[PDB]
Design an enzyme around this catalytic site. Structure first.
Site, PDB file in Angstrom:
ATOM      1  N   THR A   1      -2.835  12.130   0.320  1.00 17.68           N
ATOM      2  CA  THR A   1      -2.579  10.755  -0.189  1.00 17.68           C
ATOM      3  C   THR A   1      -2.753   9.770   0.963  1.00 17.68           C
ATOM      4  O   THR A   1      -2.341  10.034   2.091  1.00 17.68           O
ATOM      5  CB  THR A   1      -1.170  10.626  -0.791  1.00 17.68           C
ATOM      6  OG1 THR A   1      -1.172  11.280  -2.059  1.00 17.68           O
ATOM      7  CG2 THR A   1      -0.770   9.163  -1.050  1.00 17.68           C
ATOM      8  N   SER A   2      -3.396   8.649   0.659  1.00 18.67           N
ATOM      9  CA  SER A   2      -3.465   7.517   1.563  1.00 18.67           C
ATOM     10  C   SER A   2      -2.997   6.291   0.800  1.00 18.67           C
ATOM     11  O   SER A   2      -3.672   5.838  -0.122  1.00 18.67           O
ATOM     12  CB  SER A   2      -4.893   7.326   2.063  1.00 18.67           C
ATOM     13  OG  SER A   2      -5.356   8.501   2.701  1.00 18.67           O
TER      14      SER A   2
END
Ligand SMILES: *[B]([O])([O])[C]([C][C]([C])[C])[N]C(=O)[C]([C]C1=[C][C]=[C][C]=[C]1)[N]C(=O)C1=[C]N=[C][C]=N1
Ligand SMILES: *[B]([O])([O])[C]([C][C]([C])[C])[N]C(=O)[C]([C]C1=[C][C]=[C][C]=[C]1)[N]C(=O)C1=[C]N=[C][C]=N1
Ligand SMILES: *[B]([O])([O])[C]([C][C]([C])[C])[N]C(=O)[C]([C]C1=[C][C]=[C][C]=[C]1)[N]C(=O)C1=[C]N=[C][C]=N1
Ligand SMILES: *[B]([O])([O])[C]([C][C]([C])[C])[N]C(=O)[C]([C]C1=[C][C]=[C][C]=[C]1)[N]C(=O)C1=[C]N=[C][C]=N1
Ligand SMILES: [Cl-]
Ligand SMILES: [Cl-]
Ligand SMILES: [Mg+2]
Ligand SMILES: [Mg+2]
Ligand SMILES: [Mg+2]
Ligand SMILES: [Mg+2]
Lengths: 222, 212, 226, 195, 233, 204, 196, 195, 196
Positions: I1-2
């Protein structure tokens, strides 16, 4: 994983005389190889001419002493200001300790004072509440260094009378308060030399019919 | 620990040692391993000191309450079962006990019950309990008779603890003797092993292995 | 253990406390932690006591043979290289943590060595359980262009910090000064701030106090003539 | 295996050794002789892990018999015991150690004295008046402490040994199917066929 | 039982003649990641107490809310809330100490080491420590984590025993604290250059200093250091 | 399980005025079971005395090893080995087994025949030398012995006074240890006479 | 550790922090992680200090012996010797090494050798615990054929950020410039690079 | 405890149960009665973990005696066995289960038939002509398979039982100190005092 | 996840990738990690999808009930409700949440709530596995009081790099703009942001 116990080091020593009792303990507090405090009092006046020390894990030690002091207070409220005798205090402490049988106070408890005949009394406890009246008892880190010395120099163990060669024992003559304090000081000086968790200072509480007196002595700070 | 108790003509003999250890460290040589539950009941102690102490002085409170309520001395059977039922509730929790409940009543006569922290409750004539129980058993089984004098029975118990005190590293200090008759128990003194050994060796001709 | 090394104007000084411990017990109160690899190459050791001794003797022995073979005075880098390669080979299992110092024809040198075989260069260094107490002092008071007298003072002060504050360190301060163009001076027990006070009582027993069973003469001499 | 006892009296050494061989749930044999004659005046009883016991005993026997032939001379019990201790002391730091405990009973013809040696699998040797391995000693040493005198006859030694076996048969959980008793004296080694 | 996630490093402190000094850096670490650079870890309670906290930051923030709530609660039905019945350092500490030990006894600790620094009503200096185990102790100098190993030795050279306290001025004490913070920046891999410092004096009251920096650092000597032994270039 | 406390036992050594003393208990056991009360732990090679605590098989093995080595030493050197030299030999011998050590706690005691100087030394199981001026302790009751020695000891004791001090140090230490006792021996060593005394003590 | 090597017009520049840690204690704050295996072949070291020193010492020995027989070795040759040690002893080593060198024929070259012992020739390389935080920055800001001054600024800014975020990195920023002109050492102190 | 056997013949059920009580290393008692009378014509022998055995047996006894008083009637062996099985089946999914195996021998006065039930600590019930718990069956079932005939007599049953005990005394490693034998028939429960 | 949230002149913008993984398998390549707990209070989710959904659902319920009684809640209030759930259930949760919202009084605000359950008010925040790779880039490139277009470019470039280096991140870049003007959704596809 969280470990709820710790070891704060230290060492304590109780000696019962003929009409007095002493409870001594070093003032050093530690964790691992660090010194927390060079002067952290470990032996406490709990009232009713009783002195107490709970050596080992300081948090459990402080908790136990705090709860016993509380027990003395409520003993006065509930029983018309009656003086809590040393034997009664000892039994009360057994129940405090055994109450946490399955999550123990990780401490070696010793109390000192005078019995109801005015004679010197010392009681000794294990962490889960087993207790016994004793003439002599060292507790804590350097207990193994001190107790043998006390068997020899207080109870005259393995000592016999010259000329008889093992036939006649050395008679068990009584020790004065000045004589006991000499043995206490030499015990802690010796323990300081060979045990890293013992040092900084020595605090002795002396109990007589006149009350509780204190004496302090410097110990090596290395 | 070495504790024993045995039935005979003159009642019961109870004999225990005095040593308490924490690992190899000798913590005490002056331990009272016999508790005076009342003038007629004795309990021996082996295993955990605290567990034995706490729950056997508790037992004395329950026995007192029984005879207050029932106006009659509690039986050895009933007293021993109060303790065994109690420890059975705590089974698994980690209590550590090996005890003999010894007494004398009219209806039972001299009676001994072995009570155990695993819940075991056994009636019997001879019991030895503790780390040095095997050593004491040797002397007892070869010298035991029903027709022993109170004097000879007392000595056999003393001698059996001495045998174990010698060999078992976790036993020693001193020997406490008790003699139980109809009229209650009777204490028969503390006997230091350090003096008793050399006395028995000389007088009995035993322990020829050791040099004195 | 507290051990330190401090560079100065014309050489290098190393120091150490004198406490050895088995667990929480003090085995020796006046232990010698400053080891001689060669006349002008000395090192201080922390960790496993047998290892710091043994690894110093071995390298010191081979350094001596090397010096005789080459007809040259031994160099610190030779001791350093021989020590690190030996320790690396044993993958940390030889528990020797060393501060190696000395003077040779190249100049004055100061190095540290860890058990796995890694080396470090510095003007001031500290090792052992009391290294944090010692390094605190060194980081507070060290400067460039120290004199001999200032370096000895700083080194012994750093050891004292360990002695007083670290339970793994204690007793006395040993020092060794290695100056260029001079003999190395080994100052055993340079400071003695931990003498035991007089005891309250004498515990000398009356003769005949202990019970005896048998007496006999032991024959320590060889088989006799005639 | 299980119980092996030894006792040295005035003029002889007596070794008692159980007859049972148990492999797990069943008692496969009830007449097993857990001993080997190392020389005419030296007997070794043994107990430990299966296989290792006999393998070790026979290996020692072979070595002592070899010595006897080479020198045309019988080694002293002390000498034999020292050899055995060294083999076990060597063994304990091997890849797979011998898990064997032994008693060596012998009569020294030079000194005219019986001798009993107790050696465990670590190579821990002690000369004793009476000895045992495993849980045997826990019961028997109290009786021997009490009943033993160093000047007994062989018959008195056997009576004291019977008292030991009776106690074991009373208080031990395992049925060891009685013992084979053997006497070592100036005239050599013989077996008591009724015990 | 848990593990600490976002953590604060050393808190250091000492007594001096007229009061106490306490200090702590402004970093909130996330393992080896120096995640949060503006975290205040000294939390004043009234004008006579400062609580310095190390360890788990989420638990710190919880403790911060307990102390805020403690002030509110003390003010209730208390006409002398800003006078005789104001919160004392000893009251605040004992409360925290009770909580810390209770939490460890339920096997669910507040994963912290706490130092309560302050001055009492009678002018007496207060300085006492408590941690996740409920362990408590007092000393002329107190420090947590790395501070215990590196700061205490330096601070004990100024005040070695009780009798050294009246001989130590606020200028000498602050100097010692600021130096200790520099040393910790040299040697603690989870420290920051930015820190806060608080002085509680019996005469001049509470002085709270924010946005302080470690200065006068020695690094020049690094240029001369080459290789790890034999290398010359 | 722990090799150094299966058999049990203790040794203690002390220096006096122109004399040294070395003492040991006589117990050998298998943990709780007492096996032998005649297991002496002090040996001598010429005028150099060696006490050894720890695993009993290694005690015996090392005694046989140092007898072996000191006998060859004497044949080649044409003189008896001295305490200082023997100490180095023990250290060498133990360290060669660095990663497979003998589980022992040796103690050297003796008087240098040329200088007349009293000498004692102790070792850990892998060779590290503890050369104390005052006293050396070893065994399962080493903590107890440290406590006794540190209080009872004073420097420059006469042989017959030193006997009392070391005897009381051993006896009272042993009585606080489950795996020590069952008898005791004390050697009083002077430059050209050695007296050996068996002590009467409690047999539990 | 924060280490990097960057090729540019005139050659190659190696860069590194100076922090060595034992857990959270900084065992050495002025470490030299830029090490010389040949006159104009250097390397950046990350991972175990013992392992990377032992490896670098052996490589220097191999290249010294190579030179005595076959003349100056190529940077590729040096990287191959590093690889052979790191690959064949992968089970027992913890070493992340960047090899950088200057030939006249090949000019500036950079080879990275991660944990496995694989070799990767690159225009520039980053490694060590602190490198994770500057992948984004370095990818966005790297250009080929930069000047010396631009490359110094690129490494200075990059390692500054790596130091800022990584606890295992810190102290001074050391650099070593490799060109035809020779070998230049550069050092940059906290007061300089922290204000960037 | 250890060995408990059961055999149902023509007009009775015979239960044999060992006398030994061993705790670890020592045999504390050699005359222990591992049985409880649940009702005048129903007997239950038991073996398992220490404490749990007697506690469970006495708890069952109390419940059956309570039923007998309430209804002035004796439950059938089948009914009692079903009650016991339910208690053990309940027990096995408890915080701390009863670690007890039992044999229930009873004479049904309504059907005039002997009945033998074998129930383990899981609550696994089976009606059998002959049964055992623990390692006993491993030896004894082969003999009973051969020799057992269903019209046997109480004495023939005792002779076949002696042959079982002899085999156990030969091949089992543990000394169980003989057995106490009890017979359950139309006239109630009695103990064979010489076996 | 970013994931990231950034305050700017006119308010605040939330940004996120769209990748959900079960090990190395991409279970969902078009995930919406920007979720709405109130009209102008949104959050970015990282960690367990189940935990962060369960939390976000509960928060939305609490803020809906808050609104019905006390009117529009502040962003600080929303962050506090998130914290209370994340802190008190820290043993059983794996949730890293960034809370972002727009008041008229307080304008754009950003609160980050990492694993422990602590709260940190910041000008901008980054989180998720891919955030590690853009600490350097984001610190160097963030300015306060940026324009809408500048902030969109800052988030686009930042998450582009995070996606480039992090395997757990990928797909489209979603964004949600929070200002006085209202709520605007933005989407950016691989062909657009990969060539940056
Ligand atoms: B005995 O050895 O069992 C003895 C009896 C007890 C009532 C004093 N027990 C102990 O000595 C136990 C340890 C132990 C040793 C051997 C077998 C079982 C248990 N010790 C303690 O209970 C003890 C130890 N230190 C202080 C207080 N109590
Ligand atoms: B120092 O504290 O590091 C010190 C320096 C050493 C060279 C004398 N270390 C020791 O004293 C070590 C500590 C240690 C304990 C246990 C395992 C490894 C290291 N002590 C010993 O090596 C030691 C202990 N007892 C006897 C002899 N040596
Ligand atoms: B760097 O942080 O990777 C650094 C480079 C090294 C060549 C000096 N490594 C270390 O500081 C290592 C620990 C480590 C940190 C981060 C990742 C991997 C390893 N330190 C040591 O090897 C070390 C520590 N103390 C003493 C000696 N060696
Ligand atoms: B992101 O990568 O952290 C992402 C955010 C989530 C809110 C959609 N998480 C996941 O993809 C997680 C796994 C994970 C990856 C990286 C760090 C922590 C956790 N995925 C799931 O929770 C998941 C996977 N497959 C099905 C359902 N949920
Ligand atoms: Cl390095
Ligand atoms: Cl989702
Ligand atoms: Mg110190
Ligand atoms: Mg004994
Ligand atoms: Mg079944
Ligand atoms: Mg991707």
């Amino acid at each position: 994983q969280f470990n709820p116990y710790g070891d704060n080091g230290g060492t304590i020593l109780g000696i019962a005389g003929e009409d007095f009792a002493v409870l001594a303990g070093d003032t050093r507090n530690i964790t691992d190889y660090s010194i927390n405090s060079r002067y952290e009092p470990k032996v406490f006046d709990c009232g009713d001419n009783i002195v107490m020390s709970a050596n080992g894990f300081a948090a459990d030690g402080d908790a136990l002493v705090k709860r016993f002091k509380n027990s003395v207070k409520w003993y006065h409220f509930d029983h018309n200001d009656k003086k809590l005798s040393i034997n009664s205090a000892a039994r009360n402490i057994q129940h405090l300790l055994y109450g946490k049988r399955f999550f123990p106070y990780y401490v070696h408890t010793i109390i000192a004072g005078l019995d109801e005949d005015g004679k010197g009394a010392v009681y000794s406890f294990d962490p889960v509440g087993s207790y016994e009246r004793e003439q002599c008892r060292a507790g804590g880190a350097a207990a193994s260094l001190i107790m043998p010395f006390l068997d020899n120099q207080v109870n005259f163990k393995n000592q016999y009378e010259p000329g008889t060669n093992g036939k006649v024992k050395k008679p068990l003559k009584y020790l004065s308060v000045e004589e006991v304090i000499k043995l206490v000081r030499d015990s802690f000086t010796s323990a300081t030399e060979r045990h890293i968790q013992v040092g900084d200072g020595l605090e002795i509480l002396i109990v007589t019919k006149d009350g509780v007196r204190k004496e302090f002595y410097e110990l090596k700070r290395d | 620990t070495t504790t024993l108790a045995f039935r005979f003509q003159g009642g019961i003999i109870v004999a225990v040692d005095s040593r308490a250890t924490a690992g190899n460290w000798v913590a005490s040589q002056t331990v009272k391993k016999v508790i005076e539950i009342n003038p007629f009941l004795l309990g021996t102690m082996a295993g955990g000191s605290a567990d034995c102490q706490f729950w056997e002085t508790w037992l004395g409170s329950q026995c007192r309450l029984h005879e207050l309520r029932e106006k009659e001395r509690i039986s050895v059977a009933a007293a021993s079962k109060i303790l065994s039922n109690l420890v059975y509730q705590y089974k698994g929790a980690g209590l550590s006990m090996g005890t003999m409940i010894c007494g004398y009543t009219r209806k039972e006569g001299p009676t001994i019950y072995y009570v155990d922290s695993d819940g075991t409750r056994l009636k019997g004539d001879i019991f030895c309990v503790g780390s040095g129980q095997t050593f004491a058993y040797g002397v007892l089984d070869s010298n035991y008779k029903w027709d022993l004098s109170v004097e000879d029975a007392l000595y056999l118990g003393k001698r059996s603890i001495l045998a174990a005190a010698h060999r078992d590293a976790y036993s020693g200090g001193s020997v406490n003797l008790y003699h139980v008759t109809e009229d209650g128990w009777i204490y028969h003194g503390n006997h230091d092993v350090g003096e008793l050994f050399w006395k028995v060796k000389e007088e009995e001709g035993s322990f020829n292995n050791v040099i004195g | 253990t507290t051990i330190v090394g401090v560079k100065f104007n014309n050489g290098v000084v190393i120091a150490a406390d004198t406490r050895s411990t088995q667990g929480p017990i003090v085995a020796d109160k006046n232990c010698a932690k400053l080891h001689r690899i060669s006349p002008k190459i000395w090192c201080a050791g922390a960790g496993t006591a047998a290892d710091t001794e043994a690894v110093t003797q071995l390298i010191g022995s081979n350094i001596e043979l090397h010096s005789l073979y080459t007809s040259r005075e031994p160099r610190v880098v030779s001791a350093l290289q021989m020590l690190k390669q030996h320790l690396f080979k044993y993958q940390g299992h030889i528990g020797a943590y060393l501060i190696v110092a000395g003077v040779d024809p190249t100049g004055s040198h100061l190095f540290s060595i860890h058990a796995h075989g890694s080396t470090d260069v510095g003007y001031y260094l500290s090792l052992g359980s009391g290294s944090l107490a010692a390094m605190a002092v060194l980081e507070s008071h060290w400067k460039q262009d120290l004199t001999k007298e200032e370096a000895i003072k700083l080194a012994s002060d750093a050891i004292q910090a360990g002695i007083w504050n670290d339970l793994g360190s204690g007793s006395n301060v040993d020092v060794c000064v290695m100056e260029i163009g001079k003999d190395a001076e080994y100052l055993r027990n340079y400071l003695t701030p931990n003498v035991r006070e007089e005891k309250q009582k004498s515990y000398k027993f009356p003769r005949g106090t202990t019970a005896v069973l048998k007496e006999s003469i032991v024959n320590i001499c060889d088989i006799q003539e005639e | 295996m299980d119980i092996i006892l030894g006792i040295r009296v005035q003029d002889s050494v007596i070794l008692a050794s159980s007859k049972a061989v148990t492999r797990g749930i069943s008692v496969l044999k009830d007449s097993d002789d857990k001993t080997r004659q190392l020389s005419p005046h030296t007997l070794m009883s043994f107990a430990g892990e299966a296989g290792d016991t006999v393998q070790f005993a026979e290996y020692i026997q072979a070595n002592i018999q070899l010595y006897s032939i080479r020198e045309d001379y019988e080694l002293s019990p002390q000498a034999v015991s020292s050899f055995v201790r060294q083999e076990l002391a060597k063994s304990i730091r091997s890849r797979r150690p011998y898990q064997v405990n032994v008693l060596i009973g012998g009569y020294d013809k030079k000194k005219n004295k019986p001798e009993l040696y107790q050696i465990d699998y670590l190579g821990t040797k002690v000369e004793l008046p009476y000895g045992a391995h495993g849980y045997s000693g826990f019961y028997t040493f109290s009786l021997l402490d009490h009943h033993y005198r160093p000047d007994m006859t062989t018959e008195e030694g056997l009576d004291l040994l019977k008292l030991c076996v009776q106690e074991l048969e009373k208080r031990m959980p395992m049925d060891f199917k009685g013992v084979i008793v053997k006497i070592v004296d100036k005239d050599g080694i013989r077996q008591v066929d009724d015990f | 039982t848990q593990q600490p996630i976002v953590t604060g490093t050393s808190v250091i402190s000492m007594k001096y003649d007229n009061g106490v000094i306490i200090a702590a850096d402004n970093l909130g670490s996330y393992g080896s990641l120096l995640r949060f650079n503006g975290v205040e870890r000294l939390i004043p309670v009234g004008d006579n107490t400062v609580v310095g906290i190390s360890g788990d930051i989420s638990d710190m923030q919880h403790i911060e809310r307990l102390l805020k709530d403690l002030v509110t609660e003390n003010a209730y039905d208390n006409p002398l809330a800003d006078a005789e019945e104001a919160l004392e350092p000893s009251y605040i500490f004992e409360y925290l100490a009770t909580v810390m030990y209770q939490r460890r006894s339920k096997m669910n600790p507040l994963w912290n080491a706490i130092i309560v620094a302050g001055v009492q009503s009678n002018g007496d200096q207060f300085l006492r420590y408590v941690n996740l185990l409920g362990v408590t102790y007092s000393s002329p100098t107190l420090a947590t984590g790395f501070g215990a190993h590196m700061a205490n030795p330096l601070l004990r050279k100024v005040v070695d025993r009780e009798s050294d306290i009246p001989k130590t001025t606020v200028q000498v004490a602050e100097e010692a604290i600021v130096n200790a913070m520099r040393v910790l920046y040299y040697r603690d891999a989870r420290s920051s250059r930015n820190f806060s410092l608080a002085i509680i004096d019996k005469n001049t009251g509470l002085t709270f200093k924010k946005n302080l920096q470690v200065e006068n650092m020695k690094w020049d000597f690094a240029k001369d250091i080459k290789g790890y032994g034999t290398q010359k270039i | 399980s722990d090799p150094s406390s299966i058999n049990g036992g203790i040794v203690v050594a002390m220096t006096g005025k122109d004399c040294v003393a070395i003492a040991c208990d006589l117990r050998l056991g298998s943990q709780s079971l007492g096996v032998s009360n005649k297991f002496e732990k002090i040996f001598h090679y010429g005028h150099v005395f060696l006490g050894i605590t720890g695993l009993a098989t290694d005690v015996t093995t090392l005694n046989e090893m140092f007898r072996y080595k000191t006998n060859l030493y004497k044949l080649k050197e044409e003189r008896a080995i001295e305490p200082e030299t023997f100490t180095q030999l023990v250290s060498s011998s133990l360290y060669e087994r660095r990663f497979g050590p003998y589980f022992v706690g040796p103690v050297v005691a003796g008087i240098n025949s040329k200088s007349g100087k009293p000498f004692i030394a102790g070792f850990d199981l892998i060779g590290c030398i503890d050369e104390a001026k005052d006293f050396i302790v070893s065994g399962t009751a080493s903590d107890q012995l440290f406590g006794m020695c540190e209080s009872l000891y004073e420097p420059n004791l006469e042989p017959e006074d030193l006997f009392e001090t070391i005897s009381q140090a051993l006896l009272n230490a042993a009585d606080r240890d489950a795996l020590s006792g069952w008898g005791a021996v004390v050697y009083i060593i002077k430059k050209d006479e050695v007296v050996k005394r068996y002590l009467k003590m409690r047999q539990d | 550790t924060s280490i990097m090597a960057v090729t540019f017009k005139d050659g190659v520049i190696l860069g590194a922090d100076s922090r060595t840690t034992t857990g959270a204690y900084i065992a050495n704050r002025v470490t030299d992680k830029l090490t010389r295996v040949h006159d104009k072949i250097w390397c950046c070291r990350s991972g175990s200090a013992a392992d990377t020193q032992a490896i670098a010492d052996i490589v220097q020995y191999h290249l010294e012996l190579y030179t005595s027989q076959y003349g100056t070795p190529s940077t590729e040759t040096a990287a191959s010797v590093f690889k052979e040690l790191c690959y064949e002893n992968k089970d027992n080593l913890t070493a992340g090494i960047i090899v950088a060198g200057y030939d006249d024929k090949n000019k500036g070259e950079v080879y990275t050798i991660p944990l496995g012992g694989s070799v990767h020739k690159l225009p520039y390389a980053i490694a060590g615990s602190g490198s994770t935080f500057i992948y984004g920055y370095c990818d966005k800001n790297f250009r080929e054929n930069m000047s010396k001054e631009e490359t110094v600024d690129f490494i200075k800014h990059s390692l500054s950020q790596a130091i800022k975020w990584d606890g295992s990195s810190g102290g001074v920023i050391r650099m070593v410039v490799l060109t035809a002109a020779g070998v230049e050492r550069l050092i940059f102190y906290p007061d300089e690079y922290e204000q960037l």
